[PDB]
């Protein structure tokens, strides 16, 4: 085994996350193919087919059977290093592997940051409106 | 950073273990040289210069300044894969690295087994002496 933080680098681990996935034999986006593309299954009450790239953290829902997960990952996050990684896990050098984990860490932060921004912007609008409402009354 | 179980594969970690080491500048077995050879410092009250290969688990004490730790590791555990490892950590493949960790796991068990033997042999002596003492008088 490997530390939990690193398991997602492994196809077999990612495939294991797709339990309860509806798109199985006959479909283009099987868990094998989803896993090959970098995805983890992260289902919610609201979107129960929600998947996340483990590396760049793009989230995608609304899957259909004919969908090729690589072509979609490419469409919705063309900046994802993992799509450039040609070698298998065991064929990576530790330097290479450590370089990738750093990038993934940067990606994660980027996603957290951009979230906080969107949330902060949302609160700003609320607060601004509220104070306009207070001017408006007189 | 890396899981604690794996840190010992890193020289700088091993060097860090040598705190209170007496053989410093001028000596053949400086912590840098000891680390380079695979050793971790795990001193006891009784044997306070005790060092252990992280990989094959050979223990060596009674160090003197002119001692070259590679030549000693070679003398007391010539079977230790780590001494064959020419590449630096980052230059290893994960397969390679995982192959090595497996071997280290085997090594560990082998040593735990050989300890239990030594202990079992020790108890046997005590019990033998005990029965002799009793049967005699
Ligand atoms: Zn991605
Ligand atoms: Zn050794």
Coordinates of C-alpha atoms and ligand atoms in Angstrom, one line a residue:
Chain A
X1 CA 0.0 0.0 0.0
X2 CA 0.8 3.8 -0.2
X3 CA -0.1 6.8 1.9
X4 CA -3.8 7.7 1.4
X5 CA -2.8 11.1 0.0
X6 CA -1.2 9.3 -2.9
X7 CA -3.6 6.5 -3.7
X8 CA -5.5 8.5 -6.3
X9 CA -2.4 8.4 -8.5
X10 CA -3.4 4.7 -9.1
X11 CA -5.9 3.6 -11.7
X12 CA -7.1 0.7 -9.6
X13 CA -7.8 3.0 -6.7
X14 CA -9.7 5.4 -8.9
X15 CA -11.7 2.6 -10.4
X16 CA -12.6 1.4 -6.8
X17 CA -14.2 4.8 -6.2
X18 CA -16.7 4.2 -9.0
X19 CA -19.0 1.9 -7.0
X20 CA -22.6 2.6 -7.9
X21 CA -21.7 4.1 -11.3
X22 CA -24.5 3.5 -13.8
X23 CA -22.5 3.5 -17.0
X24 CA -21.1 0.0 -17.3
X25 CA -20.8 -2.6 -20.2
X26 CA -21.9 -1.2 -23.6
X27 CA -20.9 2.3 -22.7
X28 CA -17.9 4.5 -23.6
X29 CA -17.5 6.0 -20.2
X30 CA -17.0 2.9 -18.0
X31 CA -15.3 3.2 -14.7
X32 CA -12.1 1.8 -16.3
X33 CA -12.3 4.6 -19.0
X34 CA -13.2 7.2 -16.4
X35 CA -10.4 6.2 -14.1
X36 CA -8.0 6.1 -17.1
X37 CA -9.0 9.8 -17.7
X38 CA -8.1 10.8 -14.1
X39 CA -11.6 10.8 -12.6
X40 CA -12.8 10.0 -9.1
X41 CA -16.6 9.5 -8.4
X42 CA -17.7 12.2 -6.0
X43 CA -21.5 11.8 -6.1
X44 CA -23.9 14.1 -4.3
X45 CA -27.6 14.2 -3.5
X46 CA -28.0 16.8 -6.3
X47 CA -25.6 15.3 -8.9
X48 CA -25.1 11.7 -8.3
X49 CA -22.9 11.2 -11.4
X50 CA -20.4 13.9 -10.3
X51 CA -16.8 13.1 -11.1
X52 CA -13.5 14.9 -10.3
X53 CA -10.1 14.8 -11.9
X54 CA -7.7 13.9 -9.0
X55 CA -5.0 16.0 -10.4
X56 CA -6.5 19.2 -11.7
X57 CA -9.8 19.1 -9.7
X58 CA -12.2 19.8 -12.5
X59 CA -15.7 18.5 -11.7
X60 CA -18.0 17.1 -14.4
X61 CA -21.6 15.9 -14.3
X62 CA -24.3 15.1 -16.9
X63 CA -22.6 12.1 -18.3
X64 CA -24.0 10.2 -21.3
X65 CA -23.1 6.6 -22.4
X66 CA -21.3 7.7 -25.7
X67 CA -19.1 10.2 -23.9
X68 CA -15.3 9.6 -24.1
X69 CA -13.9 10.8 -20.8
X70 CA -10.5 11.9 -22.2
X71 CA -12.2 14.0 -24.9
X72 CA -14.3 15.6 -22.1
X73 CA -11.4 16.1 -19.7
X74 CA -9.6 17.7 -22.6
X75 CA -12.7 20.0 -23.4
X76 CA -13.2 21.2 -19.8
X77 CA -9.6 21.4 -18.4
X78 CA -7.1 21.4 -21.2
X79 CA -4.4 22.6 -18.7
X80 CA -4.2 19.3 -16.8
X81 CA -0.6 17.8 -16.7
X82 CA -2.0 14.4 -16.0
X83 CA -3.3 14.2 -19.5
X84 CA 0.3 14.6 -20.7
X85 CA 1.7 11.8 -18.5
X86 CA 2.4 8.9 -20.9
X87 CA 4.3 6.6 -18.4
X88 CA 2.7 4.1 -16.0
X89 CA 3.0 4.8 -12.2
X90 CA 5.8 2.3 -11.5
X91 CA 7.7 3.7 -14.5
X92 CA 7.9 7.1 -13.0
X93 CA 11.1 8.3 -11.2
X94 CA 10.6 9.6 -7.7
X95 CA 11.8 13.0 -8.9
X96 CA 9.2 12.9 -11.6
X97 CA 6.6 11.7 -9.2
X98 CA 7.4 14.3 -6.6
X99 CA 7.3 17.0 -9.3
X100 CA 3.8 15.9 -10.2
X101 CA 2.6 15.9 -6.6
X102 CA 3.8 19.4 -6.2
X103 CA 1.8 20.5 -9.2
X104 CA -1.2 18.7 -7.9
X105 CA -0.8 20.5 -4.6
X106 CA -0.6 23.9 -6.6
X107 CA -3.7 22.9 -8.6
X108 CA -5.6 22.1 -5.3
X109 CA -4.8 25.5 -3.8
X110 CA -5.8 27.2 -7.1
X111 CA -9.2 25.6 -6.9
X112 CA -9.6 26.5 -3.2
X113 CA -8.6 30.0 -3.9
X114 CA -10.8 30.5 -6.9
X115 CA -13.6 29.2 -4.7
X116 CA -13.1 31.6 -1.9
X117 CA -13.0 34.4 -4.5
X118 CA -16.4 33.4 -5.9
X119 CA -17.8 33.1 -2.4
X120 CA -16.3 36.4 -1.3
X121 CA -17.7 38.1 -4.4
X122 CA -21.1 36.7 -3.5
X123 CA -21.0 38.1 0.0
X124 CA -19.9 41.4 -1.3
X125 CA -22.9 41.7 -3.6
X126 CA -25.2 40.8 -0.7
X127 CA -23.6 43.4 1.6
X128 CA -23.5 46.1 -1.1
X129 CA -27.2 45.5 -2.0
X130 CA -28.1 45.7 1.7
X131 CA -26.5 49.1 2.0
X132 CA -28.0 50.4 -1.3
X133 CA -31.4 49.2 0.1
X134 CA -30.6 51.4 3.2
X135 CA -29.8 54.5 1.1
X136 CA -32.9 53.8 -1.2
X137 CA -35.3 54.0 1.8
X138 CA -34.3 57.7 2.0
Chain B
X1 CA 7.5 15.3 2.3
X2 CA 7.0 11.5 2.7
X3 CA 5.4 9.0 5.0
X4 CA 7.4 8.4 8.1
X5 CA 7.9 4.7 7.2
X6 CA 9.9 5.9 4.2
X7 CA 11.9 8.8 5.5
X8 CA 14.9 6.6 6.4
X9 CA 15.5 6.1 2.6
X10 CA 16.7 9.7 2.6
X11 CA 20.3 10.6 3.6
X12 CA 19.3 13.9 5.1
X13 CA 16.9 12.1 7.4
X14 CA 19.4 9.6 8.4
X15 CA 22.0 12.4 9.1
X16 CA 19.4 14.0 11.3
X17 CA 19.2 10.9 13.5
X18 CA 22.8 11.4 14.6
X19 CA 22.5 13.8 17.4
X20 CA 25.0 13.4 20.2
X21 CA 27.3 11.6 17.8
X22 CA 30.9 12.0 19.0
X23 CA 32.8 11.4 15.8
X24 CA 32.7 14.7 13.9
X25 CA 35.0 16.8 11.9
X26 CA 38.3 15.0 11.1
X27 CA 36.8 11.5 11.5
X28 CA 36.1 8.9 8.8
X29 CA 32.8 8.0 10.3
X30 CA 31.1 11.5 10.5
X31 CA 27.3 11.4 10.5
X32 CA 27.4 12.4 6.8
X33 CA 29.6 9.2 6.1
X34 CA 27.5 7.1 8.5
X35 CA 24.3 8.2 6.8
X36 CA 25.8 7.6 3.3
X37 CA 26.4 4.0 4.4
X38 CA 22.8 3.4 5.5
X39 CA 23.1 3.9 9.2
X40 CA 20.7 5.4 11.7
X41 CA 21.8 6.3 15.2
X42 CA 19.9 4.5 17.9
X43 CA 21.8 4.8 21.1
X44 CA 21.1 3.0 24.4
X45 CA 22.4 3.6 28.0
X46 CA 24.6 0.6 27.6
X47 CA 25.6 1.0 23.9
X48 CA 25.4 4.7 23.1
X49 CA 27.2 4.6 19.8
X50 CA 24.9 1.9 18.5
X51 CA 24.0 2.4 14.8
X52 CA 21.6 0.4 12.6
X53 CA 21.4 -0.1 8.8
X54 CA 17.9 1.1 7.9
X55 CA 17.6 -1.5 5.2
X56 CA 19.2 -4.7 6.4
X57 CA 19.0 -3.9 10.2
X58 CA 22.6 -4.9 11.0
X59 CA 23.6 -3.2 14.3
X60 CA 27.2 -2.0 14.9
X61 CA 28.8 -0.5 18.0
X62 CA 32.4 0.2 19.1
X63 CA 33.1 2.8 16.5
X64 CA 36.5 4.5 16.2
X65 CA 37.5 7.6 14.2
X66 CA 39.3 5.9 11.4
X67 CA 36.5 3.5 10.7
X68 CA 35.0 3.8 7.2
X69 CA 31.4 2.9 7.6
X70 CA 30.9 1.4 4.1
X71 CA 33.8 -1.0 4.7
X72 CA 32.3 -1.9 8.0
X73 CA 28.8 -2.4 6.7
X74 CA 30.4 -4.6 4.0
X75 CA 32.2 -6.6 6.8
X76 CA 29.2 -7.2 9.0
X77 CA 26.4 -7.6 6.5
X78 CA 27.7 -8.3 3.0
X79 CA 24.1 -9.3 1.9
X80 CA 22.6 -5.8 2.1
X81 CA 20.9 -4.6 -1.2
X82 CA 21.3 -1.0 -0.2
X83 CA 25.0 -1.2 -0.7
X84 CA 24.4 -2.2 -4.3
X85 CA 22.1 0.7 -5.0
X86 CA 24.2 3.1 -7.1
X87 CA 21.4 5.6 -8.1
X88 CA 20.2 8.5 -6.0
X89 CA 16.7 8.5 -4.5
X90 CA 15.0 10.8 -6.9
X91 CA 16.5 8.9 -9.8
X92 CA 14.8 5.6 -8.8
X93 CA 11.6 4.4 -10.5
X94 CA 8.6 3.7 -8.3
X95 CA 8.9 0.1 -9.3
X96 CA 12.5 0.0 -8.2
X97 CA 11.6 1.8 -5.1
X98 CA 8.8 -0.4 -4.2
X99 CA 11.0 -3.5 -4.9
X100 CA 13.4 -2.2 -2.4
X101 CA 10.8 -1.5 0.3
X102 CA 9.6 -5.0 0.0
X103 CA 13.0 -6.4 0.5
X104 CA 13.4 -4.1 3.5
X105 CA 10.2 -5.5 5.0
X106 CA 11.5 -9.1 4.5
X107 CA 14.8 -8.0 6.1
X108 CA 12.9 -6.6 9.1
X109 CA 11.0 -9.8 9.7
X110 CA 14.1 -11.9 9.3
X111 CA 15.7 -9.8 12.0
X112 CA 12.7 -9.9 14.3
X113 CA 12.8 -13.7 13.9
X114 CA 16.5 -14.0 14.6
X115 CA 15.9 -11.9 17.8
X116 CA 13.2 -14.2 19.0
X117 CA 15.6 -17.1 18.5
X118 CA 18.3 -15.3 20.6
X119 CA 15.7 -14.7 23.3
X120 CA 14.4 -18.2 23.2
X121 CA 17.9 -19.5 23.5
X122 CA 18.4 -17.2 26.5
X123 CA 15.4 -18.5 28.3
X124 CA 16.4 -22.1 27.6
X125 CA 19.7 -21.5 29.3
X126 CA 17.9 -20.0 32.3
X127 CA 15.5 -23.0 32.6
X128 CA 18.3 -25.6 32.1
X129 CA 20.3 -24.0 34.9
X130 CA 17.2 -23.8 37.0
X131 CA 16.6 -27.6 36.6
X132 CA 20.2 -28.5 37.2
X133 CA 20.2 -26.3 40.4
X134 CA 17.1 -28.2 41.5
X135 CA 18.0 -31.8 40.5
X136 CA 21.5 -31.4 42.2
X137 CA 20.0 -30.5 45.7
Ligands
LIG1 ZN1 -7.4 16.9 -14.8
LIG2 ZN1 22.6 -2.7 5.4

